[PDB]
């Protein structure tokens, strides 16, 4: 688990950027993913969580990102993107990838964390 | 949502979270993790009571009722919880709690 | 001078002639005396017939079994099949399981015979395994390997002297979509040729409510070998391939209790004496049952 | 004629012993979708304790009044016993 | 006198013990599946046969008792005409 | 000078002891005093079960048994038959109450026909007519929209649900009443896929029309959905019934006991009289004359 | 119940013409058609009916009448069309169209009538 | 076929229908028509003496054995019409017309 | 009372008088794949036997014993016959 | 002076000296068959019940047979279907058939009703007859005649006044090739119509097992007609037409013994109606009883 | 039974030659057919059998004389072909022509025998 | 395999010899005449049972693990070699037998 990562910088405020990320320590194919936030202060906070597409399934973003924030799985190359658009000053945050334990019938919460990438919005 | 406490070697402290029946119960589907300044987050106990492999001695825990504690033994010189939602998209997330050595 | 005898005794006796009197002796019918516990059964845990036969991830601890006389399993497992579906015939599977003598399990089938198709992302997540998706480990989801579908021509011989048993199933898709993108064929069916059984079948593809999980279903079938005969598989797409085999040689209790010829689902009967107003429904044998509290004779001096 | 008793002991081993034998029976369920066939069972299963019961408290009372019966015939039996030498 | 009470009750003694039936409806099944009613027959006149089996004859011997105990009823009281000679 | 006890009577007694004997008090077994007449159970003319349900052109809330007879002549019109209609009515004789619900509006079928589609076999006032508990859906503008409606039951009952499928006489009739030459229908639930097609043949004139009708019926969970697809010869039902949890012959209208030709009124351990009844009956027998005796001989 | 009628005339023996029907009210697709004579003396005579679409069938010609009558039906302009052929002097008489009361399994003798149209053959 | 026999106010006057047991019987539907000079048929009677809608009280009927008659009650002046009924005959293409009867009043 | 015969000989006729009737009946067979309804056809055969074999050896002894009880009652019933004149 | 009565002869105790010992258990069967009431049972040496209907070429002895009561046949018979596959749903037809009356044969369809197919080359060599290949008598096997296979589309009125029997079968290839070549549809179903019963079929083609020769296998239907409905027929290729229909007019024993009562069992035949016997409880017939026991006696006639 | 045979003649060693065997007077699609080999000294010897259409199969040659010879079948022109090459010198021989007999399940044996040509090969 | 060994008025018979693997209690085993410059003809086809078309001249037996063929009659053109073969099972084709000569003076 030596997962990678790429992007982040500093944009304008309703711009667009986009970030990926890779890893090789593992088959792609059995890996539950999900992205989370970290904010000074608060700390963590929920951005969704992807299927895998033999279970099919879709994107079920955050109500406070809802209609905004989309995500990308491309299990041939082991690449996941995120699209950013019309971002505000409030999405300055460092973000976290992780995969997640699995329970019961979904899984829960993180297990494996990289050392994640600020983002910041100013004028 | 989940709330946790705010912020000597040889000693040996305690660090509990209060959480609610809606967030917790008698489920045993609880983290806690471990963070460092300028580091990741790191898994310290999981599964409660099942502390992993690869790790030391010194966390420990349990829980009881609507709280849980976690013991730290053995402090040297040199943190956060969720919970188990049911089939909601995820778990909770609390507030953290600063450690200070002295 | 001599008359009759006179005894004591502190026993009531019923008959038609009065409504209560009292016995020398009570000699009773029935017993209660029931132990309240149980070759040697097959004592599983939670592990369902169709999960533990299936291999579900949570089974590990078993099927190294000897011999078994009879199956014990409480009502509503909770390690019933993850994936929802049924077999086809379950009933008359569990009859015939009933008896089994010794069973001993025997990969008839080795992985490397698929070389052209792939195995490791066959996954499901409704029944996830030490924290990780997973899958049954006693059959094959084979899945698109190269965006290409070979057909699948394996034969049997049966080269031994006892029977086999064989499991295989068939997917369906919970759409159009999903048909597209694991199996390259948007028609497939599936051909099973022996002696005495000729089989056709083909997927089913509607809308479905969200029962647990993921919306598809699994349809699992069962087919007995003779020993001195072969079997035949032709598949287009959709196929389970299982890859061990039971081999069997010759000819239920459902409750939970912890740990004699004679067996009920509360207790074990130490008794055969004529009967007893306990449980009549018993496994194996019972002397009788009775509708009734007591029924007693009399004899001795 | 003192020890009787064996006489009516064997009796009760003669009504242990003549209920036969059976065989490896199970208690297997049916499917819902035919619930015609569960009701047959039922039938079947619910006939045949009937008689059973029925054929047990027959036996059980009628030996017992038996019993009886040979009990003070036994009695009438020493009484004749005694009789005969005067 | 009046020992009519111990035969009345074995009158009411026998409907008793007859027990209770669920409530069962005889249903018809399709002519596609025939053996199922010739099963189905096997029974009905099976339970009729040993019922009237259980009827008439074992109606009888209770009839046989009940004359037999009338009969001898009948003699235990020419016992005690005898007591006092 | 006392001696036994000489009475007299009128009646004879059998037993193994003899051929006939007299007997002092004849108390009689078995009884054969039915009184010919009939929770109230239902009672029907001449409607069958199938026509009931369907809605045939020729009562609330709650009833215990149904009342039948043999041949009835308002039978389904249209021939053909239910498949697993003897199931149906296993599970129809203890329905307790029951209630009729419309829960699909007729509006709900604006881009398909809905007033034309009768059939000859039952008419009714004169002028032909088709069933009032479904509808036959037939080609609107010449053209056939896939039907996919859905329904949620956010009711806390269970429910029943009717529906059918067409066979056309031969090609020609397929042709012009629907679109697509080759159909198929869709059913999806919790426990239940099906699929189906319609069988083209050559048939014979049974009664009056060379058609068939085919009819399924299913049990719906009361948290669970039901969905529905189709691309012709599709029947679609306008009512269903808010179920909660059989007499084959009658006769003209306070017992439990009941028979084909009258109302068992006596609980004596059995009788000669017709053994098939419904609920609890005392018991069957063959003979005619059974008797205790007993009474005042001391 | 506004049932019209048109066609009639004289014609050569052997020729042809057409008559057609036309009415509104009730639904036509749910509607038996028959068509009648009527001559003067003897009364009423059948001439033959028409079926419906949605239960199949076809027309059938009493058997003086067969092989030269022929009746077409169109539901979506609601006409009924006359085909005569091959007349004959005894063709001379009225015709009156109608609905039939739908009875057990057939449709029986009329229920309502039309205003009537005479027709005649004649050297 | 169906035979007819042939042709004053505040009378009472009885027409009756003879027909076959293959065109007539114990069944309960035979009509009865009204026919005026110039006019076209009228429903007068459809189902054996139970009265249609919208028709005066002028007409009754009844049927018995392999007759019926039709009873007409109050002769007024303009009640000179004719009248034809039809039967019943089987699964045949359709039924019988009978012979008509004219009603004269002077 | 002599030549009693007549009246007990009817009793051997009684027990083979009556006995039910039965009609045509043939054990019909079945296919492998569905095994279970053979159990089910195994349970009442065997059931039936068994009361019937219960029956057997049992209402046809007490009948025995009634035999040889009817017999020696018998006896008594001219040893009373004896006495009248003494 | 005068004592009870002395004789001698030849659940109170074990065993009793009986002074008549009047047996109500008897075991001398004959072990042999019996002359029932006029309908003598159908005697088959080693011909089955699906070979008998069928026709099987070593099955021509008995053609014509009267008025039966029951079947005797014997196990694991020889002369069964040479061809593999079994009868669908057969087991019911043994259940019907039991009580026929009289079984006539009716040529209902003449062999000359076939023009534009053939059927001299419908033979198969799995039960050969006089040393050449053959087929079932009963059935005609319809065949490609000049490699064009006109839809057939026969019927029947049943203008008779009794219930008729018919068959007809479906043929399985086991390859492509085999399809190809027979029938030229590459792609076959037939139809059955008639008052009360719907049947649509297709071809199984798949890759099997050899068992007796020939990798295919036979399906074999059945149906009874109504005395007044007709019947209809389609088809485009596989189809097996009958020749022969019987008729039937209104309403089973499995061993072999060699050759007058109403009982009779699959070892001998049982003369005595007699309450209680204790051999084979599987019988045909008016059984008087079964009981597992060997000794059942009841004790008079004398002492009195 | 006319069977009628031609061919043979010398050719050398490894050569090839083609003979045909014709019969009328029974079905030949209802007939078996094989071929049989007569040496001097020894006599009879197995060459091989070919099968029938309507029960497919296929033909097996014997042992010896395995991947050279081979039969071809047309019933439609009532003719049976026999293909030989790569030929040494004891192929020297006739060949006589024959129908099997049928039993149980297998041809075993002839019935009918043709009058036979004979064949040498030599240098 | 099978093998046999090499006046008017009188009578002959010529024996059969082999083995169990390719004779015994079966009944599929042949007969054949055969004569110089001539076809092979089918004398006895069964065991004990004369075809058609041909004279009382042959007839034979079969017991144990070997068959007899009796020849009445032996006139001078009775000069032939006389062939036969047995049944093997499912394989491919029976097995010949060695033919046997037969010399009249």
Redesign the interface.
Known sequence: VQLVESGGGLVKPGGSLRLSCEASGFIFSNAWM?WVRQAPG?????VG?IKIQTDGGTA?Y?APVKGRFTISRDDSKNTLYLQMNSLRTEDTAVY?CTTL?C?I??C????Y????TPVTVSS | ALTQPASSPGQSITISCTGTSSDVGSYN?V?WYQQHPGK????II?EVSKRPSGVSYRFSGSKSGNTASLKISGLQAEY?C?S??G?D???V?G??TKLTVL | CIGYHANNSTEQVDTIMEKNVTVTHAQDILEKTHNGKLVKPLILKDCSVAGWLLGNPMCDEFIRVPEWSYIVERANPANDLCFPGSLNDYEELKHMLSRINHFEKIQIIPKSSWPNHETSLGVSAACPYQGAPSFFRNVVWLIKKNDAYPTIKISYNNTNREDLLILWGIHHSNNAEEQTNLYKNPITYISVGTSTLNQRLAPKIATRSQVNGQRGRMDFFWTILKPDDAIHFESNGNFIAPEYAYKIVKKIMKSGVEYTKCQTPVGAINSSMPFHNIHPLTIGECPKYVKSNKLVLATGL | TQKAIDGVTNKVNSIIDKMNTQFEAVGREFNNLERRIENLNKKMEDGFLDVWTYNAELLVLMENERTLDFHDSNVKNLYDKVRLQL
Chains 1, 7, 11 share one sequence.
């Open positions: 999900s608060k700390g963590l906070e929920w969580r079920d955050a976290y334990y329970a019938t979904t829960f919460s993180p297990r964390w990289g050392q994640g | 589907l983290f990741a987050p790191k898994l999981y956060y969720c188990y939602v089939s998209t995820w778990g997330f507030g953290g």
